[PDB]
């Protein structure tokens, strides 16, 4: 029954990832006064499936100067971690569920760094360290935000936890600036605009590349569900769609930062703000 529940979870995750990448193309097109994919299937509804099948019959490039095992292992590790994080969202009852998902998302750094070590490109090694530095820098603000969230999460028996079923079903109006910081931290983790300067998958083709992008979009959906649980009073389909629309909307209208600019932002703005909010919420919670 656990294997059945996990496969029944896995099916809409992949279907949703295909529909997310189509919806990103089409919403980005509608903001730019065009159409986006319409030809490939009726209303363009077959475009992600033909992208996946095109990459399926695409030639796998295995460079004969790299280490083949780590090269194969990097997108597998990314994909596996995304699927495991989704299972932790929906098929768990653990006491420290948010800490579990934070631990899983801290493991997601390895696919980037294994891709940087494996492929023998000069600037893949240069960009992997930058991407890892960005993700590493914003993980701390995510953790301090979780500290602020957990100060008010108590179940019926009186025990404090990070269990998702014990979270309240009303929006957390008291933590609006922390919610905004959380959303920009999600944007920084997924390497989206305005942090998309670093790429690391420059040597990958066919289904290894497809695994990289499925992992990226599934991680975006994980973080969207986490933000909707923590701040928006629950996990729902409408909230997932609205937050995804917001992320595409921000990608349509903004330019990106330099490397040192978002490093200064994450180490001089977001971390002191989350720590100061934690101290204020701890003072309130007494």
């Amino acid at each position: 029954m656990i294997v059945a529940s996990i496969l029944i979870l896995i099916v809409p995750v992949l279907l949703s990832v295909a529909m997310f990448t189509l919806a990103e193309r089409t919403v980005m097109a509608s903001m730019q006064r065009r159409f986006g994919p319409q030809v490939s299937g009726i209303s363009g509804l077959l475009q992600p499936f033909w992208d996946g099948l095109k990459l399926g019959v695409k030639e796998p490039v295995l460079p004969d100067s790299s280490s083949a095992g780590a090269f194969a292992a990097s997108p597998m590790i990314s994909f596996v971690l995304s699927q495991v994080a989704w299972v932790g969202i929906c098929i768990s009852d653990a006491s420290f569920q948010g800490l579990v998902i934070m631990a899983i998302s801290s493991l997601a750094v390895y696919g980037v760094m294994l891709a940087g070590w494996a492929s023998n490109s000069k600037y893949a090694f240069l960009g992997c360290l930058r991407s890892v530095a960005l993700m590493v820098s914003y993980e701390l603000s995510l953790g301090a935000a979780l500290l602020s969230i957990g100060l008010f999460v108590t179940d019926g028996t009186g025990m404090k936890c990070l269990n998702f079923a014990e979270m309240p079903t009303t929006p957390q109006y008291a933590m609006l600036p922390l919610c905004l910081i959380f959303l920009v931290c999600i944007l920084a983790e997924t390497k989206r605009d305005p942090f998309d300067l670093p790429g690391y998958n420059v040597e990958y083709s066919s289904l290894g590349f497809a695994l990289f992008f499925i992992a990226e979009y599934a991680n975006m959906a994980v973080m969207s569900a986490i933000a909707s649980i923590y701040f928006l009073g629950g996990f729902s389909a409408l909230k997932i769609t609205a937050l995804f629309f917001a992320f595409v909307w921000t990608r349509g209208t903004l330019p990106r930062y330099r490397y040192d600019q978002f490093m200064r932002l994450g180490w001089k703005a977001f971390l002191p703000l989350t720590l100061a909010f934690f101290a204020l919420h701890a003072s309130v919670a007494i």
């Binding site: 001089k268 002191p272 703000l273 100061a276 909010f277 204020l280 919420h281 003072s283 007494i286």
Partner: protein
């Protein structure tokens, strides 16, 4: 310069640091001074349960 000029120049040249220190100070000050002035203030199992039922039955 006085408090006002130095504060305005500091918050104009670096607002996030000043606002972070203000949030931290508000929390520390509320727990130190504001909380202990306004908000701060063997029966058997049968009396405790009777009180719980009395609190439940009116609402």
């Amino acid at each position: 310069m006085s408090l006002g000029e130095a504060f305005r120049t500091a918050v104009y040249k670096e607002p996030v640091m000043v606002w972070s220190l203000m949030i931290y100070g508000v929390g520390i000050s509320y727990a130190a001074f504001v909380k202990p002035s306004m908000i701060e203030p063997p029966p058997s199992l049968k009396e405790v349960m009777a009180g719980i039922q009395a609190k439940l039955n009116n609402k």
